[PDB]
Amino acid sequence: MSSTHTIAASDPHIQVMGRTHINDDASLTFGYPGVSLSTIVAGSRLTAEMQSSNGNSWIDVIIDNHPPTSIKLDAQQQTVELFHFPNSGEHRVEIIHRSENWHGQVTLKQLTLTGTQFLPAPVLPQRKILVLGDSVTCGEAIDRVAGEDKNTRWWNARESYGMLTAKALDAQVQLVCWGGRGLIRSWNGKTDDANLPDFYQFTLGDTGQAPQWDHHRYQPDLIISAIGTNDFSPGIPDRATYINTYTRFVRTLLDNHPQATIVLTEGAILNGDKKAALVSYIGETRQQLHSNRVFYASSSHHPGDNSDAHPTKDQHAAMARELTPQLRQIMDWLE
Template sequence: MYKILVLLLSCLLWQTSHADTFYPADNGYFEYVGRIDFSRPATPRFWAPGVYVTARFKGPRCEIVLNDEMLYGTSHNYVSIIIDNKPPVRQQLLGKSDTIRLHQGLNDGPHTIVICKNTEAGIGYLEFAGLRCQELLPLPVSPIRKIEFIGNSITCGAGSDQSAKPCGQGQWYDQHNAWKSYGALTARRLNAQWQLSSVSGIGLIQSCCGMSFTMPQVFDKINMHRDSILWDFANYQPDVVTVTLGENDGPQDSARFCQAYVGFLKKLRTYYPAASIVCIDSPMADPTFSPVLQRHITAVVAAMQDKKVSKYFYSRKYQSGCGGHPDLAEHQLMANELTTYIKKLKRW
């Protein structure tokens, strides 16, 4: 039986072989997916949930070096680490600079490792500094298919994972898990790359929780939470874009909401001329708001008069996680639904 990898932080003793080499983040063998600031190539910086780095290495051990912003001096990001497609290890970082050491259960390889940011921009950025291992190897060809999932806390995977701390304990981000969110799951099932463009609390015309910006205002940014650093859409042209917005807007004037939704979709079309766009309802919406949102989405899709814009409504509500969010099991069920829909839509 595969042994769960033991993660030991830099405060623990570590005997590194003289044969091991440190490969900095600007090495061409690393693959990055997501909105990333490469202005400092040796420490690429990323905020969004679900950004992931993939590498392939030889040897029975490796070290991952990450820098955590430690926003407000106290916030610590979570990551998921996956080796050879085995069950992920979810790890919270502990300091400004973290060395995560992986060795138990590894043979000489080669091995493929994925490092995924589980928490969102509101918890601060991560910087990938590099990998120490016996030998860094070139990766096989990446999946050609690409999907982008636009949304709010649901898409972030917020409130879904109680493996470390139950609901109501710890910080608001302790139950985040982007790796196991419906978007990431759907993409992996369809053999596609993914990008989560999502912020907890965000809306189309009104956001919650004192947030002063909406998705149309910040969508063109790398750090959506601070509306900063322009993103180059040429870097990632998805085949499919899903939009899950409206929960945080709540009941609004229908004409104003639909007009804003149509405007946002038209902007998306300028960024992604060939993409299929799927407008999705909220799996959290209460019985009063749910039919209202579905009517709005139906009207918006009709108004677009675009054959590549469609809608999908979940078969049921998914609200068993923290704060009424979907839990991990429900993200699996949501991914089941979306995988079936997108597979048929794209004939994948």
């Protein structure tokens, strides 16, 4: 007999890495980039019911070891074919959110397998990393192509330095980042957007009605904070103000994640005086913290290219190569 088997997105057969909101109909909604949902199945066809809030969100779909397929999701619910073969076999399926919150939020409602069964969920690594930051952490402009107007297709989470670093360290990762945002102000000088200490609390979104992320749902071994580019965009911010708020934020992290090691870094975009100032502010933050759980990693500036100052795909690869060795020493993950 031919049979189908449909499960909700929130079902134990679907592995989830990254922040998701569980809706009352057992669908999952997510906004941060890098959110990864995976399943292993025995069958010939697998489809998903998906939608995005603004029709401006992208995902990657990876079947077994094949090249990924990037798909832009319509604002209306649509059946998305993940794979289809003439015969049944065992297949691994991964969906990766490429977009970030301002692009919209994506919802996966349910999956339908034509075949025999969903197998046990893919097993994730034991090690867990959380990366906090701005659009560089979010993977903005990694997939740029010369000649195109920037659009939401340019974002790539899998090839961002945070995901490459986690992969090298055999670790899970959550990316909690928002383009244009800072620790205390946005690139445009505005101080009353949700800053990093605000959106760090949200499962997705950033309005008065954004759902609170329960930290018990992901307790990282390592937290990297790479925030700062946008705080320095208008000019170098006031030293006491910045250091006092960075200190207060890392105190929140330390208290929320009692087992975590925290690594602060200025990121790749700032250069020259602005870079040196943020490095300085980080050193003084650490001095005020007096914590044997808080460390620093140095990094190079990467200039982007003629089309966009955001670091390129090859620069993100370089960034992971520079950061990873320092993280091994800090975490004793000499692996």
